[PDB]
Each structure stands twice: as C-alpha cells, then as structure tokens.
Amino acid sequence: TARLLSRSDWGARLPKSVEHFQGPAPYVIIHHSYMPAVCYSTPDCMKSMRDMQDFHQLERGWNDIGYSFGIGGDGMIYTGRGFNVIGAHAPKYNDKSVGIVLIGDWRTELPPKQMLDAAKNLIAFGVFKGYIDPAYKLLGHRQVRDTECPGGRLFAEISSWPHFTHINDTEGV
Ligand SMILES: [Zn+2]
C-alpha cells in the first residue's frame, strides 16, 4: 500500500540548487528525525516534510531538506533530494548514498511496521531501478558521525536488515 510521493505532492519548496553524483549509490544511511515526532496521517506527514525542509533551507541555509527520502507514520515514502543527488545528512557520504529518514524519535520505541516495510520497499526499488548498488552497504548515521541518530531502538532494528554492516569489520587505513 506504500506509494512514493513526489516533492510536489507534499508542497516542497524548490531546491536552491541541485548537485549530482554518478553511478548507483554504494551506501544507504538510515536516520530518524527526532523532531518532528512520528506523524500518522498523511497531512501531518506532509507538514513534517515541510517543517524539516523549512528548518534546513531557511534556518541552516542548505540547498534543500538534507535527506534523500523521508518515511512517514502513514506508511508513505516522501521524495526529498531523491536518488543520485548529493545530500546533507551524512558527512563524507553525501555524494555516495541514499539518506532515508524515518520521521519520529526512535531511540526507544520501534517504528510501526508500515514504516519499516516502506523503507525496505524504497531500498528494494532503488536497487531494482539501478539507483542503489546491488552490493550496497546499509548503515545508521551513528556509524559515520558522532551522533545518536537513528536512535538506539531503530539502530538495533536495522542491524537485522540485509546488507547491514559495521565499518570496522574492515581493518586498515
Ligand atoms: Zn541522522
């Protein structure tokens, strides 16, 4: 039942500028938003995408909302910067990943199933269309930066996902 909604679908303001990266993304980075909290109705979710984009563009002076895609409590996927566009959600990975933010604070509570499935479907489609490398590596934001994101509970959940990985599984500069 999960649909991919376009930027226009949620009333997104235009990017101030769009940078690109080539090839299929070798990484998928999972985030939670922390604030806003989980949204359950599509209209609340569309406003949460708007609130994050306002905060990003207007208050942080970024070109657009920092993530590639957002996932709402309504089970819908929301287009952010989209595939193959450099993001602003994970330093050193912005030009080689798909940053997916599950809307809400997931440090302790587990995201409802429709959200988990939506993120899986989004990734599957990414690989199906060639936007995500078939040997992609799945990570949580905390593994590449000093942050608690995507929350302890959501992080334990993604560690059970196919392709999940730990950077230090590999030794060597
Ligand atoms: Zn994050």
Swiss-Prot record:
Gene: PGRP-LB
EC number: 3.5.1.28
Residues noted as binding Zn(2+) in the record, renumbered to the chain: 31, 141, 149
Cofactor binding note from Swiss-Prot or TrEMBL: Binds 1 zinc ion per subunit.
Annotated GO biological process: defense response to Gram-positive bacterium; innate immune response; negative regulation of biosynthetic process of antibacterial peptides active against Gram-negative bacteria; negative regulation of peptidoglycan recognition protein signaling pathway; peptidoglycan catabolic process
Keywords: Disulfide bond, Glycoprotein, Hydrolase, Immunity, Innate immunity, Metal-binding, Secreted, Signal, Zinc
Site, Essential for zinc hydrate coordination: residue positions: 67
Glycan-carrying positions: 168
Reaction it catalyzes: Hydrolyzes the link between N-acetylmuramoyl residues and L-amino acid residues in certain cell-wall glycopeptides
Domain N-acetylmuramoyl-L-alanine amidase stretches: 25-151
Protein's UniProt name: Peptidoglycan-recognition protein LB
Induction text: Strongly up-regulated by PGN from B.subtilis. Regulated by the imd/Relish pathway.
GO molecular function, one term: peptidoglycan binding
Part of the whole protein covered: 29 to 201 of 232
A GO term from the CC aspect: extracellular region
Quaternary structure (record): Monomer.
Protein source organism: Drosophila melanogaster
Function: N-acetylmuramyl-L-alanine amidase involved in innate immunity by degrading bacterial peptidoglycans (PGN). Probably plays a scavenger role by digesting biologically active PGN into biologically inactive fragments. Has no direct bacteriolytic activity.
